């Protein structure tokens, strides 16, 4: 069911081939290739939108509308 929590799956796709910052978060088995430099992260996050963002969208909308 839609549970009213305002949570959703936040996905971060980290394709960091060639990156000097070493992987560490994933601790499962290694592939022995470029998959060891790439990762899919997912996390349940409460989705929040700020007052400031809402004010910015309001100002954009007023400026772009005509009639």
């Amino acid at each position: 069911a839609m549970d009213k929590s305002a949570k959703a799956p936040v996905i971060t796709i980290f394709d960091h081939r060639g990156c000097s910052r070493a992987p560490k978060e994933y601790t499962g088995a290694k592939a022995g290739g470029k998959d060891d430099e790439m990762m899919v992260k997912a996390q349940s996050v409460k989705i929040e939108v700020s007052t400031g963002t809402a004010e910015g969208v309001l100002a954009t909308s007023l400026a772009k509308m005509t009639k």
Binding site: D3, Q43, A54
Partner: protein, 177 residues
């Protein structure tokens, strides 16, 4: 089902889940079109703020009464809730595209959603336009026919994945319209 993400999708906990290395190698052969699929998800979620704001502000420029004193986006509170819902929807669509399966979108986002909107008076015609604009954004990011210079990915044809993501947006539209 993506078992690594089972707790994520049930909101069982707030712990991050990670799929790299051999688990990622296997994931890309479990789902189809694996590399292109992950590039497609990346191009949508990395642009989420702009997709949602452009969709909501387009919904509004087409129907300005939404931010009149009687409209359902009037006040920062209502605008923020609308932008938040656009993002929740976009993110569940992004998970359908990651997994190649609409189940979590249908079951954890869409089931019961229309009846909530009806009780609140969230206008369905306006909501459908926000969703339609988000869909157009996602299709353009996935099936991006600019030259190699302008793409973050090796050039090729991602029209199939763009059609697939379009179908997930169409499931949202059918559920709430």
């Amino acid at each position: 089902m993506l078992d690594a993400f089972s707790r994520v999708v049930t909101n069982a906990d707030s712990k991050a889940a990670y799929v790299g290395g051999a688990d990622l190698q296997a994931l890309k052969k479990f789902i189809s079109e694996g590399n292109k699929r992950l590039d497609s998800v990346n191009s949508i979620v990395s642009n989420a703020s702009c997709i949602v704001s452009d969709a909501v502000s387009g919904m509004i420029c087409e129907n300005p009464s939404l931010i009149s004193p009687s409209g359902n986006c009037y006040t920062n509170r209502r605008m923020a809730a609308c932008l938040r819902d656009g993002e929740i929807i976009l993110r569940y669509v992004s998970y359908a595209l990651l997994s190649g399966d609409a189940s979590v979108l249908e079951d954890r986002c869409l089931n019961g959603l229309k009846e909530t909107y009806s009780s609140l008076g969230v206008p369905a015609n306006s909501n459908a336009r926000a969703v339609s604009i988000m869909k157009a954004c996602a299709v353009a990011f996935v099936n991006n026919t600019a030259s190699q210079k302008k793409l973050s990915t090796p050039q090729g044809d991602c029209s199939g994945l763009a059609s697939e993501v379009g179908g997930y947006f169409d499931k949202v539209t059918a559920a709430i319209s």
